[PDB]
């Protein structure tokens, strides 16, 4: 795996905020050099929060509510809804964005 120091720092912040807001994690994986925080208790369609080596923080979900998606795009996240209903929300990694993203996910 090729995990950078920035990724570790970003993942640490992500985990800190996920714990703060009561998101229960089954585990965190390092897969294809990406960090995946896998939710044990899926909420509002969200399956995992990710810190990817491509520079983005991503939310992987399934059949999320449109008005929920709107709150994420409202803070700068890009969104792609697949034919199967899977939703991919992306935004560039930064302390500010990680904080903003988790805050929104917590107020859903």
Instruction: Please give the tally of structural domains in the chain.
Output: 1
Report the C-alpha gap between 67 and 93 in whole angstroms.
Answer: 23
Phi, psi of 58 (to 5 degrees): -130, 150
CB 72 within 8 A of CB 87: no
CATH number of the domain to which 41 belongs: 3.90.1150.20
For the beta carbon of residue 103, count every other beta carbon within 10 angstroms: 14
Alpha helix (H) residue ranges in the chain: 5-20, 66-73, 95-106
Query: What domain range is 71 assigned to?
Result: 1-108
Method used to solve the structure: X-ray
Report the C-alpha gap between 88 and 80 in whole angstroms.
Answer: 5
């Amino acid at each position: 795996m090729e995990i950078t120091s920035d990724m570790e720092e970003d993942k640490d912040l992500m985990l800190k905020l996920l714990d703060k807001n009561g998101f229960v994690l089954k585990k965190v994986e390092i897969y294809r050099s990406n960090y995946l925080a896998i939710l044990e208790k899926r909420t509002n369609g969200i399956r995992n929060f990710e810190i990817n080596n491509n520079g983005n923080m991503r939310i992987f979900g399934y059949k999320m509510m449109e008005h929920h998606i709107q709150k994420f795009t409202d803070i700068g996240m890009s969104c792609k809804i697949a034919k199967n209903g899977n939703v991919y929300l992306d935004i560039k990694r930064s302390a500010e964005n990680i904080e903003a993203v988790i805050t929104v996910a917590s107020e859903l």
